[PDB]
Amino acid sequence: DSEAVVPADAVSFTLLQEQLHSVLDTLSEREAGVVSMRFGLTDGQPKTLDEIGKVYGVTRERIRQIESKTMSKLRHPSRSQVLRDYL
DNA sequence: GGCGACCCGGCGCCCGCTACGGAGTCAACTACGGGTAGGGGGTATCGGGCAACGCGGCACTGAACACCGTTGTCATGTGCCTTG
Incomplete structure (x- = not known):
């Protein structure tokens, strides 16, 4: 069958989640929160920028810049060696 | 007319795992009518890209006063000399 959850894939995905x-916890609290909302690491629906900018009380553009800074920081070679192997 | 064989149906199963071949197949038709679905066309709505512009530390603005420090300064007090 195709629906059977491969245990290897399941455990690899759980390790990826952890x-x-x-790595997000390594980043600052606000930065981790905004990037997680932008990519739905807590909920299956990511929120676009201005939709992040309602519960947090920041503008649709302030959120955009800090999200970009979070992406730049994550792209740093520091917090990338571990995530590269997971693809 | 219950016993009786016998007859028959009817059914029940028939060690263990790996490992080990493929193969796949014969007889209507058209007309309509709708409805969904596709396509492009155009339109309201959401999302992405930039400098001021919020702040804050401090810093300058020294300006304008304050804080001691100082040699300005004064009218007023001792010591020697001349005359009562």
Whole structure:
């Protein structure tokens, strides 16, 4: 069958979730929160920028810039060696 | 007329795992009518890209006063000399 959850894939994905959450925790609290909302790491629906900019009380563009800074920081070679192997 | 064989149906199963071949197949038709679905066309709505512009530390603005420090200064007090 095709619906059977491959245990290898399941455990690899769980380890990916743990590593991703830890790497986000390495970042600042607000930065981790906004990037997680932008990519739905807590909920299956990511929120676009201005939709992040309602519960947090920041503008649709302030959120855009800090999201860009979070992407730049994550792209740093520091917090990339662990995530590269997971693809 | 219950016993009786016998007869028959009817059914029940028939060690263990790996490992080990493929193969796949014969007889209507058209007309309509709708409805969904596709396509492009155009339109309201959401999302992405830039400098001021919010702040804050401090810094300058020294300006304008304050804080001691100082040699300005004064009218007023001792010591020697001349005359009562």
